[PDB]
């Protein structure tokens, strides 16, 4: 019970017993906490509760010190001192923002704003607290039981009465019972098992709530600026292919950490892998939150880096199919590609953390705790999608509040910015450059004259809360008959239920805006489906239209985003 104050580091025997994390609070801070919030239980070796038998007084403001013991106003001895007095709570070794983080339910955006504007120790407190709250919320959902098995990829479920049903999509991974993790999509429903198993009737599935470990390392280490490249040894013979990033690679060796903003198709993977060719002796650990982002770094490394010095770290609890061309789980190889949740405890000359808009402050801290590096490089784009905040229902979370890295990129600017989009036809580059990049993103490709927009509200239907717009899919079908080259297009929408309907009617491969991030396709057909804050989110809109290399067809619902699209308008 002897620890350090989460607000001023002063040693104390006190912990808040009403806080879900039970943080150590010193005498000065513990008082300021209990007197301002509903939190009145204070813990030490022994809790601050009335020692008199049968007495249920646990409020520290109603308790006193009777010799070396604690009693309430009804049981205290004549010579007794209040525990709460003189701006302090008695203990050993004798904040407005800490109060709000400790008591908030994490359903408002203002909660996440505070979690990113507070001090560094409060960012960790905020991140463990939020993650613990997100986990305890998983238990609130009802158990799903197999009623009947139709085929190898379709079934019917029975839900627990009195408990809400969790939204059916890929963002919700059930744990089957220990018969492997499973996922669901919309009485015909689709079952998806990680471990192949002959679907058992009666066997149940439950969202496996994982334990929230405490945070020790900061989100960002303290920044250091050096006079020369430190601990890294550059080449002189540097491939012309990567010469455009030499000044930026040197910037990386002259700072403890650096931020890189890379809009879609500006060369982020190319920069990440090229940094290994610039410091050829350096041991680089490549990390991201998702397996897809780590796999995209593996694909780029396979093309430029020696395969024998690469290793893809895969957790023994192998959830989904990932990169197979490196030696698996060899932590000591020069190049280690691994998700944040699977990071081993090791050191590196450079740590590259990719897809930074998808990281939370919890992930930022874990990386600093498992990896001790000479240099840390954060790559991503705050104009792209953030990690889903399952508890957030009220307010919109702005890019400067995604995490510490995003906050820096939106306030003091990124250290480096990849200014030329090489993927998209100019119509798309011109649209997103004005929308989210302050006109600083430039097009490399010409206008393709294959970027179309159509304003068509259709009819909005719902599969619970996930939306469907069948008339917008009907407009796509009409378009495909008249433009059969577009049959090679990927259908994209902000809703999985819209995607499910379009998969059956159009036969095109399907992808939500959120799962399309990081990928590129020749042709994209996007239906906005609705005009909600979700389908109108500028970061989501930016990701949606920057997936295309050649052509895009946008069937729009919102007049605003439709008018901003610098595309050829279509009629019907
Ligand atoms: C990369 O951006 C382009 O290619 C743009 C859009 C394309 O339609 C024409 N273009 C020109 O730069 C240009 C200058 C003079 C005549 O055209
Ligand atoms: Zn304190
Ligand atoms: Zn508390
Ligand atoms: Zn009492």
Quick overview of this protein structure:
The chain is an alpha/beta fold and 572 residues long.
Give structural notes.
Zn(2+) 13 binds at residues 50, 55, 72, 75. Residues 1-105 form the CV ZBD domain. A ribonucleoside 5'-triphosphate binds at residues 262-269. The N and C termini lie far apart (71 Å). Helix 2 packs parallel to helix 4, helix 10 (426-436) packs antiparallel against helix 14 and helix 11 packs parallel to helix 12. The protein is an alpha/beta fold. The chain contains 15 helices and 33 strands. Strand 5 (63-66) and strand 6 (69-72) form a beta hairpin. The chain has a domain at 421-564: Rossmann fold (3-Layer(aba) Sandwich). The strands form nine sheets. The protein has an eight-stranded parallel β-sheet, sandwiched between helices. A six-stranded antiparallel β-sheet has the order 11-10-15-12-13-14. A six-stranded parallel β-sheet has the order 30-29-31-32-26-33. Residues 426, 443, 446-447 line the site of the ligand COC(=O)[C@@H]1C[C@@H](O)CN1C(=O)c1ccco1.
Which strand order spans the largest sheet, edge to edge or round the barrel?
Answer: 19-18-20-17-21-22-16-23
What is the gyration radius calculated from CA atoms? 27 Å
**Ligands (ions, cofactors included):** the ligand COC(=O)[C@@H]1C[C@@H](O)CN1C(=O)c1ccco1, zinc ion
In the CATH hierarchy, what is the architecture of the domain at 421-564 at level 2? 3-Layer(aba) Sandwich
Shape: globular
The level-1 CATH class of the domain at 421-564: Alpha Beta
Stated plainly, the CATH topology of the domain at 421-564 is called Rossmann fold
Distance between the termini: 71 Å
Beta content comes to 15-25%
Structural class: alpha/beta
Major sheet summary line: 8 strands, parallel
Tally the helices: what do you get?
A: 15
Q: What is the CATH superfamily label of the domain at 421-564?
A: P-loop containing nucleotide triphosphate hydrolases
Number of strands: 33
The residue fraction in helices comes out at 25-40%
PDB class: viral protein
Keywords: SGC - Diamond I04-1 fragment screening, PanDDA, viral protein
Assembly: monomeric
Entry title: PanDDA analysis group deposition -- Crystal Structure of SARS-CoV-2 helicase in complex with Z1614545742
């Amino acid at each position: 019970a002897v620890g350090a104050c989460v607000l001023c580091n002063s040693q104390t025997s006190l912990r808040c017993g009403a806080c879900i994390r039970r943080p150590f609070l010193c005498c000065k801070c513990c008082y300021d906490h209990v007197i301002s919030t509903s939190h009145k239980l204070v813990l030490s070796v022994n809790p601050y509760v009335c020692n008199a038998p049968g007495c249920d007084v646990t409020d520290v403001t109603q308790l006193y010190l009777g010799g070396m013991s604690y009693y309430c106003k009804s049981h205290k001895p004549p010579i007794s001192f209040p525990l709460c007095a003189n701006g302090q709570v008695f203990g050993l070794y004798k904040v407005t923002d800490f109060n709000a983080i400790a008591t908030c339910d994490w359903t408002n955006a203002g909660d996440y704003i505070l979690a990113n504007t507070c001090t560094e120790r409060l960012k960790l407190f905020a991140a463990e607290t939020l993650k613990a709250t997100e986990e305890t919320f998983k238990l609130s959902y009802g158990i799903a039981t197999v009623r009947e098995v139709l085929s190898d990829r379709e079934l019917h479920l029975s839900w627990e009465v009195g408990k809400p049903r969790p939204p059916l999509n890929r963002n919700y991974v059930f744990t089957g019972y220990q018969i492997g993790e499973y996922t669901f999509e919309k009485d015909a429903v689709v079952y998806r098992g990680t471990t192949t198993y002959k679907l058992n009737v009666g066997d149940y599935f439950v969202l496996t709530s994982h334990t929230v470990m405490p945070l020790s390392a900061p989100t960002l280490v303290p920044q250091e600026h050096y006079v020369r490249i430190t601990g890294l040894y550059p080449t002189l013979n540097i491939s012309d292919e990567f010469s455009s990033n030499v000044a930026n690679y040197q910037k990386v060796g002259m700072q403890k950490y650096s931020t890189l903003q890379g809009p879609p198709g500006t060369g982020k993977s190319h920069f990440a892998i090229g940094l290994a060719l610039y410091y050829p002796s350096a041991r680089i650990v490549y990390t991201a939150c998702s397996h897809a982002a780590v796999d995209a770094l593996c694909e780029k490394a396979l093309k430029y880096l020696p395969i024998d010095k690469c290793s893809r770290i895969i957790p023994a609890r192998a959830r989904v199919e990932c990169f197979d061309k490196f030696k698996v789980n060899s932590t000591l190889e020069q190049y280690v590609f691994c998700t944040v949740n699977a990071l081993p405890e090791t050191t590196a000359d450079i740590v590259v953390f990719d897809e930074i808009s998808m990281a939370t402050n919890y992930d930022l801290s874990v990386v600093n705790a498992r990896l001790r590096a000479k240099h840390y490089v954060y790559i991503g784009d705050p104009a792209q999608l953030p990690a889903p905040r399952t508890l957030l229902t009220k307010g919109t979370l702005e890019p400067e509040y995604f995490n510490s890295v995003c906050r820096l990129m939106k306030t003091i600017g990124p250290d480096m910015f990849l200014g030329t989009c090489r993927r998209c036809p100019a119509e798309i580059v011109d649209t997103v450059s004005a929308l989210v990049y302050d006109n600083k993103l430039k097009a490399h490709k010409d206008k393709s004259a294959q970027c179309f927009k159509m304003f068509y509200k259709g009819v909005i239907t719902h599969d619970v809360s996930s939306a469907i717009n069948r008339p917008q899919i009907g407009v796509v079908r009409e378009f495909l008959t008249r433009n059969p080259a577009w049959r090679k297009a990927v259908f994209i929408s902000p809703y999985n239920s819209q995607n499910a309907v379009a998969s059956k009617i159009l036969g095109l491969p399907t992808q939500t805006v959120d799962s399309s991030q990081g990928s590129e396709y020749d042709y994209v057909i996007f239906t906005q489906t609705t005009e909600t804050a979700h389908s109108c989110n500028v970061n989501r809109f930016n990701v949606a239209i920057t997936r295309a290399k050649v052509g895009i067809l946008c069937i729009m619902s919102d007049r605003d985003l439709y008018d901003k699209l610098q595309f050829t308008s279509l009629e019907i």
